[PDB]
Design a protein around this ligand. Sequence first.
Ligand SMILES: Cn1cc(CNCC2CCN(c3ncc(C(=O)NO)cn3)CC2)c2ccccc21
Ligand SMILES: [K+]
Ligand SMILES: [K+]
Ligand SMILES: [Zn+2]
Length: 364
Amino acid sequence: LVPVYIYSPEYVSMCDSLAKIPKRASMVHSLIEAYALHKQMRIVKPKVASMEEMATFHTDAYLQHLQKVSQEGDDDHPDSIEYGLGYDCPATEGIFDYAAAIGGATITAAQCLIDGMCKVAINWSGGWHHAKKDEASGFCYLNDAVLGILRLRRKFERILYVDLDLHHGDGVEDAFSFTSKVMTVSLHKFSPGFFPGTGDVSDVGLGKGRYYSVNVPIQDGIQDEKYYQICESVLKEVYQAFNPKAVVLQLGADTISGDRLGCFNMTPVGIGKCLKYILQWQLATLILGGGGYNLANTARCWTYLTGVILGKTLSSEIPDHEFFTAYGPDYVLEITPSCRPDRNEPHRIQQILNYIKGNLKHVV
Ligand SMILES: Cn1cc(CNCC2CCN(c3ncc(C(=O)NO)cn3)CC2)c2ccccc21
Ligand SMILES: [K+]
Ligand SMILES: [K+]
Ligand SMILES: [Zn+2]
């Protein structure tokens, strides 16, 4: 019953080097350990993914290119245009090893779930949901969520992927767009000019996977109570129509008030309610992180959610620890949203929910 916590010092040290989130993995782990939450979990060292494990989704040519430019960080290689490596996804030195470690961490969590070691396994440094089988994308060099789902498919016949990141989980949706055995549900900002431009409510999958992809397009300024209302309404229909046997849950914290992107107006309490609704299904659940560019707020969010997973209530006072000064000026766990307009007109929200309920009729 005790949740598995994927962690090692080597793993955190590698994840700390990712370009857009310097030291975020150490902050997340350090805050969790300062609340002593790791003492209530089964700590599991992640294995590094092998080439053949990564190739269950990614092409050998992509992985070999990534490995080659990773050796010295060749960010000027003429073939990188083939593979999505460039301004947004630079060929950092060591990026292949970091990708292999994150992929391996998510696979390890999936393996713990299928071995019955736990009902909940956590890889807070995972959630690289934009990566494609032969292209890096949106800071994602390897799609560890896809690798996790594929591992879970060795044992579980139907997997539900739920993506609460601010951005559409397009890489995961694409990987499974043509199958009814994996259903993807993404709540995300959908607006002209907002990356990656996909995931309208009319995108429902393709072929035999038609109606087994679900997209909930949301506008700026949504807050906890309406977001949870939307999420519960969709997930309730999904659970009834699809009958999942296992769940992969991406919890990117770029929805949280105070993020540099400043789109949604969420607090960890609202995401926590979504998490609780999924946990009460009592299915094997693989928990991933993702985006989150206010480093201290992301650590606030995921520490709180770790608390939710353990059924614990955490003290408001941020405990003294290595990154204590990042939590100023108030040094508390809670995040106060700002007072700004919610651009989600309730009639449009009901149109979207009705559309989705109609789509899920076609599902058995
Ligand atoms: C496909 N496509 C490509 C572009 C080019 N610019 C996009 C950059 C990509 C890189 N980037 C980016 N990546 C990941 C995240 C994240 O948190 N993902 O969960 C956030 N930000 C900034 C925006 C683009 C812009 C708008 C709409 C679609 C478009
Ligand atoms: K999302
Ligand atoms: K699908
Ligand atoms: Zn994001």
